[PDB]
């Protein structure tokens, strides 16, 4: 009966809660009182990329951490040479309302998708010299919130239909579908080795998925609102989240629970994007307030601010070598920081 | 060789400029409304295009989405007007459509955006009224009907219309304005054209400090 099943669910939930609480002896801050603080960090705008006609929704760095792709709701994908600020490619998308883009780690393909529910893969390196769509991944039943290449043939997606999916790009079929969420899924992050990934959802819970087994290994629920942003720690054992409730939170995959919280009373706005710096000491965050903030991931002291945007900071990204940070914004410009 | 890449980038810039001109002068309309509403008449998003008097409209019939809107609706702060279509003759759903209109209008993000509200299917509404405020409403003579209309039809349809305008006026002081219409109808392009001209005019009045 439904009552008995739900009671068993609640007792299991309390077992999980008690295990996590028994593991929760110390705190990250309680240890890092002795850590030398980062102090102030100032980063200056080293570049500004001024091509996009409208609000920029996503950006992603190529693995050769110089090329960069960004998407804006005007229906354009642009690949930027982050050094010379040249536009390497400008791609007219079929659906104007693209909400995410990603760069293949081989650099051969970019993916983008949005309100059309289709993740389109574009071949950058055709012999004809133009950029053509390689494939369209149609199987989702909701807006695509995030995609991330695993490699030139496998891409994970997140959708408003509550499912994350793994795809075989050669065929275009879903290989395995990840379902356990209840609200619209908002962001992805592939583990460094790409065996696991974490997704954030409007149900304020974060989940850890097995790319191969296809099953939810863990669920995290600390936030009080929809999670807009999620990012893996560089070692792959912890991840940060960003929520409309103005807080970022660090969770540990081996402690199975929240490790740290990043908030300041002055911050009322929702977080739009998070990313770690290469060593993992700095946790950046994008906001509906136009400023992005830098958090000492261990101390939680707000080490700095990236002030140079005049609308919603919609996307953020650190280079693979950490030499720069990009941020896109609803003012339609991408600022590269260092 | 860098010079050749820069010439490529500047060719791309010229093409982007040629796009930006068409981006500015087109008007973007978000077309919302329940399943009952016959909004078709005038995979996800359908980005229909049309024009009036050399003004080109982009109408995004968002659809095939989970019933929640809170997230994907933030995309459309850039639109000139939401077009909200409601099938007036489905008396029972009409309260649900009313709450839907409330959720749109008082949406944190849409606060700037006017709503062109089509009270659709006037013909079925009339034929039903010939064959919902059953007790204590009568038409204010400030608005008068077209010839041939049974005053029962008029009083009913102006009751429904008032119900939406009531929500439109109880909040959103004057930042955005609901433009109700009755329709079935070849003129719906023209109604949109006129109400978009009016929305743009009011936006200018605000912007030019007039």
């Amino acid at each position, epitope marked *: 009966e439904l009552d008995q099943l739900r009671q068993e669910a609640e007792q299991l939930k309390n077992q999980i809660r008690d295990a996590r609480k028994a593991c929760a002896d110390a705190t990250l801050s309680q240890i890092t009182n002795n850590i030398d603080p980062v102090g102030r960090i100032q980063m200056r705008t080293r570049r500004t990329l001024r091509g996009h006609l409208a609000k920029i929704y996503a950006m992603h760095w190529g693995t050769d951490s*110089r090329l960069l792709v960004s998407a804006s709701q005007d229906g354009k994908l642009i690949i930027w*040479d982050s050094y010379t600020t040249n536009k390497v490619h400008a791609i007219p998308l079929r659906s104007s309302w693209v909400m995410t883009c990603a760069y293949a780690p081989s650099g051969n393909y970019v993916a983008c998708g949005g309100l059309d529910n289709i993740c389109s893969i574009y071949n950058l390196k055709t012999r*004809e010299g133009n950029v053509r769509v390689s494939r369209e991944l149609a199987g989702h039943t909701g807006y695509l919130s995030c995609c991330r290449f695993l490699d030139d043939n496998q891409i994970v997606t997140s959708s408003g239909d509550t499912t994350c999916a793994l795809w075989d790009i050669e065929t275009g079929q879903q290989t395995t579908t990840f379902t356990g969420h209840t609200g619209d899924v908002m962001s992805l992050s592939l583990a460094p080795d790409t065996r696991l990934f974490v997704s954030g959802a409007c149900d304020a819970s974060a989940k850890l998925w097995d790319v191969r087994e296809g099953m939810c290994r863990q669920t995290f629920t600390g936030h009080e609102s929809d999670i807009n942003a999620i990012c893996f720690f560089p070692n792959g054992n912890a991840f940060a989240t960003g929520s409309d409730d103005a807080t970022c939170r660090l969770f540990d995959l081996r402690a199975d629970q929240e490790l740290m919280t990043y908030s300041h009373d002055n911050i009322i706005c929702g977080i739009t994007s998070v990313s770690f710096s290469k060593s993992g000491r700095l946790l950046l965050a994008g906001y509906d307030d136009f400023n992005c903030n830098v958090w000492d991931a261990l101390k939680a002291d707000r080490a700095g601010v990236l002030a140079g945007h005049d609308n919603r900071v919609s996307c953020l990204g650190v280079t693979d070598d950490g030499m720069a940070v990009a941020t896109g914004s609803w003012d339609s410009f991408l600022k590269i920081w260092n | 060789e860098d010079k050749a*890449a820069v010439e490529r980038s500047k060719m791309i810039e010229k093409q982007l400029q040629k796009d930006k001109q068409v981006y500015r002068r087109t008007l973007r309309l978000l077309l919302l409304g329940a399943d009952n509403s016959g909004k078709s008449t005038i995979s996800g998003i359908f980005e229909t295009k049309f024009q009036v008097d050399k003004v080109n409209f982009h109408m995004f019939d968002v659809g095939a989405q989970r019933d929640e809107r809170r997230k994907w609706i933030q995309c459309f702060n850039d639109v000139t007007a939401i077009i909200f279509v409601v099938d007036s003759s489905d008396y029972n759903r009409l309260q649900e459509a009313l709450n839907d209109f409330k959720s749109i209008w008082n949406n944190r993000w849409l606060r700037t955006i006017s709503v062109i509200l089509f009270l659709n299917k006037q013909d079925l509404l009339a034929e039903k009224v010939l064959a919902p405020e059953f007790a204590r409403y009568t038409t204010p003579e400030d608005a008068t009907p077209e010839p041939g209309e049974d005053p029962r039809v008029t009083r009913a349809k102006y009751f429904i219309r008032k119900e939406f305008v009531d929500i439109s006026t109880a909040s959103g002081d004057g930042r955005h304005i609901c433009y109700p219409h009755f329709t079935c109808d070849t003129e719906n392009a023209r109604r949109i054209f006129n109400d978009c001209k009016d929305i743009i005019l009011q936006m200018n009045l605000r912007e030019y400090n007039l």
Partner: single-chain antibody
Amino acid sequence: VQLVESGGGLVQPGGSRKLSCSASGFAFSSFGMHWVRQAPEKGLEWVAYISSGSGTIYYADTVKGRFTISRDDPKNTLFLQMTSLRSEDTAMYYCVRSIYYYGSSPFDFWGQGTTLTVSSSDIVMTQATSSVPVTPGESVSISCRSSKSLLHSNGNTYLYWFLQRPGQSPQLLIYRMSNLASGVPDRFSGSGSGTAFTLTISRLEAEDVGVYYCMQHLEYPLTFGAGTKLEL
């Protein structure tokens, strides 16, 4: 992808002739085109250039003023109007596409070429030997030297390697030092010190027989090294 050069034939000296090259199977408008020349049994020699969108045009000073390079993007065609042809101008003229952006492969594709018969302080590329006979399965290291450092301040070396098989147009082997072209087997390798460079064919096969040409792209009244032809 297919470039078909047309025009030429035989000209009385002092006449005029116009080459026409028709491109197909690629986005003609986005590629910068070059005309390259090869006098009979001689080396390759640059002739002209016209960037994408006709915004930039260059010429070899040998033909400056005499030759006009033009393109017709809507018709995917490349032209070369020749005004007063001298005996020197007798040669096969190859159309070449090149596209320049971060990571592109310029000169990657060459037309089949058309034959025309007629009745200082730049970079100079020197190739050590006319020929090298070697048996299949051996390794080879063709070498080149430049009068100027092709290592640019931006950190990449603008040396190119082309292989012209007997009776074929050249095909790009390495578009910048060590940047192996597309469609060529990993056997070919390249490196250099910024003034001297060597094309290492790691494990030779009978398919490699032909003439190897180096080419610079650092600063271009574009110029080629003389041919080195492998034998077996």
